[PDB]
Amino acid sequence: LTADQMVSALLDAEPPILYSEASMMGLLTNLADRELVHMINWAKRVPGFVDLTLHDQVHLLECAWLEILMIGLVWRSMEHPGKLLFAPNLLLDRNQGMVEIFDMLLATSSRFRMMNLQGEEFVCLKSIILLNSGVYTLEEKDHIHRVLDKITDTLIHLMAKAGLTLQQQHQRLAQLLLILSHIRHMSNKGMEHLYSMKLSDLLLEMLDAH
């Protein structure tokens, strides 16, 4: 596949923006739960995902589902500084919270804005999370890394086409990937927070994997 077809394929597979309706938890469960149904269909449309086994697809989504949810919330909240756009009708401030995990989402949102992250780079970073979050947990592993190398080739291509020099392409690719380490830390603390809230049948299944 191309570097251009990779972006358009990810751009076309983007999920929609859903709407919302002790009290705060209620809106977030229904939002996450309904938001994963589209994430399952989006995952199937990521190049190379359907090539994996049914068990591999399950495991990859079991450990990356909350990471993808958070990077998506950060993306649509990137242009609402100091706020988080859970939904078009659910734009919440830093005082409407939990807050520990709230501040981390805002810092990431303010960081993407600092780097002026583009949509073409967002869909790539989101696909990397889906394929990398569970790769370290034999012939199938080489294929996942083969796709990951292709997405990396796509990120660089987007940076090179943007006028960046080689030193700046490597620096931007490093800055983007280093944020995934913080996005994973946010999901780790978010899994402990939702496990300390004891929802939805599909959710609870995701809660028992961690």
């Binding site: 399952i40 199937k44 399950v58 599909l202 299944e205 995701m206």
Partner: peptide
């Protein structure tokens, strides 16, 4: 369990 039916 459930997750399998969604990808199925």
């Amino acid at each position: 369990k459930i997750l399998h039916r969604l990808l199925q």
